[PDB]
Amino acid sequence: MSQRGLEALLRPKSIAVIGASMKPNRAGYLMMRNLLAGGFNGPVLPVTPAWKAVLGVLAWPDIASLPFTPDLAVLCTNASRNLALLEELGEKGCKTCIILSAPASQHEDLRACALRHNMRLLGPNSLGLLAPWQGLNASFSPVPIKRGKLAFISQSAAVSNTILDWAQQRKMGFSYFIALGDSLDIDVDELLDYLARDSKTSAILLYLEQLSDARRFVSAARSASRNKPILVIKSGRSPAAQRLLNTTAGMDPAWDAAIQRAGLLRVQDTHELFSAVETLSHMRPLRGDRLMIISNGAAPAALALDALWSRNGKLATLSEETCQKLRDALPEHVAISNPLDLRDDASSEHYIKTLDILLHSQDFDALMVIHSPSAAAPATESAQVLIEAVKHHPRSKYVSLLTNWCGEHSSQEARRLFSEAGLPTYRTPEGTITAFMHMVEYRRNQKQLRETPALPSNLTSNTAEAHLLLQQAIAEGATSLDTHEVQPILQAYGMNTLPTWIASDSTEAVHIAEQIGYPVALKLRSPDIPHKSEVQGVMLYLRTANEVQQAANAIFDRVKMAWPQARVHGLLVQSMANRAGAQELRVVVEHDPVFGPLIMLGEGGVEWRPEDQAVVALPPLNMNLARYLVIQGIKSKKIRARSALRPLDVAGLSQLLVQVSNLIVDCPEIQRLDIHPLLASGSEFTALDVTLDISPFEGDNESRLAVRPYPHQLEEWVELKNGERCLFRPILPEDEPQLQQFISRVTKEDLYYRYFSEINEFTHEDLANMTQIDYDREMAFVAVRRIDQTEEILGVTRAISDPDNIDAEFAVLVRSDLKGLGLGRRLMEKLITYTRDHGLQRLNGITMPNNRGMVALARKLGFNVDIQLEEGIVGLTLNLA
Template identity: 35%
Template sequence: NTIQELFDCAELTAKQPRPMGTGLAVITNGSSPGVMVTDELYRSGQALAPLPEQVSAELDKILPASRGRTNPVCLAEDAAPQSVRDVLDVCVRATEIHGVLMALAPPPLSDPADLAEALLAALSGRSFPVIICLMGGARIAGAMAMLNQAGIPTYETPERAVKACLCLREYARNRAALTQIPPRMTRHLGINREIAVDLLGKPKDGEVMPDPDCRAVLTAYGMKVLPSALAETAKEAVEKAREMGFPLAMKLLSPDITHKIEAGGVKLGLRSEDEVREAFGQIMSSAAASQAAKGGVLIQPFMDQPDYEISLSSRQDPVFGPVIGFGPGGIFSEISRDRALGLPPMNRLLASHLIEATHVSEVLKGVRNRPPADVEQLQDLIIRLSQLMIDFPEIQELDMNPVLIKDTKAVLAGARLRVARTHIRSPHHLVISPYPAEYEKTVTAKDGSPILLRPVRPEDAPMFQEFYKVLSSKSLYYRFFTPIRELKPDMLARFTQIDYDREIALVAIAEEAGVEKMLGVARIMGDPDATTGEFAVMVGDPWHGKGIGGKILRYCLDIARDRKFKTVEGYVLAENSGMINLGKKMGFNVTRDGSEVVLKQTF
């Protein structure tokens, strides 16, 4: 939030290892620093966990009986440096503790350098996250310098130390999230882009799309919308109401009024034809008083007492492109600060993180005998909204509020879409490149079987794991130049979470009984200049000799040529004669470099 926090966080991530969990121990000499640390954690929405029993038992051996075994661990104000070191040593050795925050004020007649030396001795040769707050003004400057030179960040106040600690924890959590495998979609999106193209081409620059057209666009992208009917007269409203059945909601159709409730343009819970006539007259009178353009009214079923209300939205940001928002819905959504933002493209994992970043996510799990919301359906809604914003840069803003949830299922009750004409074409309005579906194509293997070549997706991680099970130790050695026993999570994430701007990564897929099976993979890792790249290719042992490696590598090269790469090269072990021969057939220049052979192709 501040420049100071930015530099504190940068120093900490540069000097300290990432914590392997959330277990935090706080060590202080005196109760006041401990209270300050606990209060700052509470203000940040965090809490200290009790010390593990084993740690308490260890502290019993070194602390006087007058000192508690709680977290924070409060030493005496005049605790000797050796006592501080002993307590730190216990916490660092405990497997349940993943980081230590120390808030210490050296006693007035002591030498702070002695305390610094004791701390350095306790941490010597250990890679463990430790954050130290030293309080005492100018007299502690030398001790702080000693700790800083040893790579241990120090802070002058407990509040700064706590914020830096939480930053390190958040950084570790974000890094861990990068290795998570997004679950596969259990439902196909099934969008109809052609309908949306036609409808979005109608509004003028800056215009709000008519409500029926907006609903048609959302329906075309597979979002469930409450059925509705347009009525321009009271008689027509009664006829539509009779057909639809009661109870009903009636809303003014006007591009001039954004907040229709405040303008008297919404009537809810209409249960008779007389109420429909009266509501129509009142809405038209309110519109006339506001001097707003009138397009009639929209009639739709009234969902009485929904279990939950949420809102989904998106805005075009001049820097980040479309930004997706998720939060509570209803008339208070705009003043609620409980809102999470994310950037497309969205997959199920990112949609899940977006939902979980809000307080309303706890409510959606079910409260007061209300059933929990169908979270997978909400994730689908976010993914569909993400795809809509990817496909149409001209959508300047889109508000879907409220999204009503009843008996676990969500349905859109209202939406507002504004169009702004732009010369930018998809996907160039995005800061994160989406999955390049245009690179999907089907080829034929030597035995005549069809093979799908497509870009790698993050959800392909389980398929990669199965693929590596069929690779021989020889194939793995030829690919990685070293024996590989298992595909670790960080390596799996690197292979499946692709930066589509800089990397070309394709898989060869065969479908057996409706299940995709990975036959091979090829990739070109582009350098930052986007003109040179290094290729790699691998085919599963059961499918050698079917021409798969050549087809997938050639397609990678075709894409690299289209992207204006100038040079692509690869490094092959000298004994890998199959790859060397393939390179020669494909026109690579072959040179020897010690135990390796360099295959190079210039476009």
């Protein structure tokens, strides 16, 4: 757990090799050779009973004979010695170990032994790790490595070797390269936490097959991706691959939803992985999504345009002033527009003139340069002149460059030169377009996740009634419920349903059917098989009573012949007037073994297969996320906009989805929910048929989800000295405008005291950072009071903890005109109580002398005060909270 302890693995001062050997075909031999060639600054200690020296290095007979305690150890021996060697290492005092091989029946003993001695293990069957900046190569890989700024994490040795070979071809390096093996003790989330703070790393790439702890992964990825881009490839999308990899449990749309919610992006295949390596290594970050293209030929540009159109990209438009490329610069047979075709006989000088003129403008955000083989412009010379021209231009640092030099045999030297100058290069124009659109989409998703949500209109949630009804249902032994029984539960949360009636025989069915509209639907009450399709028990559109009697008798007869023993409660009759022009939708909620409950949206009438015709999301939902889900559904053509005559209403559907999310979050007894179909008619949404599967539950009900929901139990009413009453509660994303006003009503000196600097404005991004928090790692309380249905913020306090949950940093601020009423003390006391109950061990803060009020309050609250004059700093620390 503790981030302390990974230091020995990633920055060791000494390493021991157990099983080093002189035989050239042995694993110990290869590991020793790699370590000696790495460039390490510490000692490498071989341990073996069969040799007095290995590759010129004096050896030691056994572990106990070592002159001192090694930082890191590697086992290169048969699995049958694992436990004894591990025990000896634990006795010696080593704290980190890499294990070459082990069967699956050994995991429990290994974990117990590691716990006994407080040792960390890198997954068994691991290839190893490489850290070029420390000159460390502790791996069994036959491929060399070079220094760089990209980090890679893999759960597969073959992929690791392949990527290393690709990097060798292109003269590119890394900052860290780690193989996880079986991930018994050390796992992906800890490494993400570590890499988020490494100064030499600027981007992260991952290949994954399975996970064990979803919430920690989501939180770590969300925290890490705030300042560095992260991409992921995940295999095993088909039944045969799942069987091959032994990962049959789980569902792939859940992976899609989880990856999207954390701010990452998924790549599809091997080619895109290589392109991602190139792009993350060399491309400059984007400032927009306008593209400009120039070429010495038409057809390659046409192919690029087709690729761009397939992905909904945007072409840049030239201005009238920039169009002076016609006047003198270029010959008269070149048409001036985007894309710019310089023709087959273009020379390098044309390229340079065009590049200069284009760079001195502001009409685009990225530039694509295409070159095909030609006599008038040899590849190497044109590449050299391009590199020089880009180097010497004053405004080159404002746009992103991309190069695509076609011709495999004649472009080798040009590509080599591009690599050493730090400019990205690609093999085909379609690949270039794909690489560009990847980053465009990444930025779009990150921006979309952070817009300000609106307040919800409806606020109805009668939790107690729903629990009461569900408890009564489970008491009798019921395991599923139908529309008639489910209507009150849905109504308790503000959802409408079509009325239905119960009939015990065909006579009553006919009586009620004629009492209502004759076009009706009949449904048997089947408690044995709840499946509609099994017996095909739903039939509809019966215009005449005679049809009703015939259908009822047919159902009864086929039941008594096919399956008489089943218990019969009667039929269900409902009027269905002719309506299909109203749009029909389907909503399903299911439980994933890995990520927990999942919400899916799709079309109603058609057959159900979520892998291809459904969009997904993780609860809990607010208005913004539900809107995002609906708009994704519309864009991907899986949901037809205005399928009915009336256009679809987005806001009402978002509200309904929010209500469904509330219901699912509140009641853990529900295992599955299905609305088939949901009728959309303007601003009216109604449920036609609905089913629920229920079961007893025993747990906390908060650890169920991958994202911690809003902690409603922390709300509390307080009374001040003057008698005023207010509410203390956690902060919400919807609070942004009121926070803007609150900041507006604070003086400059108080802002200087709070933020230790001068602040003239807070943008939307800072406010979003303040209001949209992860409740597992951060907490903030606000004090509010209501005036004529409008809230108002009086103060705020905050605490930010470390990933290990040991230390946290605190702050507090009160409105300038409400100083001496006791708000600060109450806020701080509530924060102290919460942090102590959460499991933290310390609070830390920093302020300056001449902030007398804060120092006095901290002394009143029991803090330890450290005034360091001559540096103008005061330290504050509180122990048991």
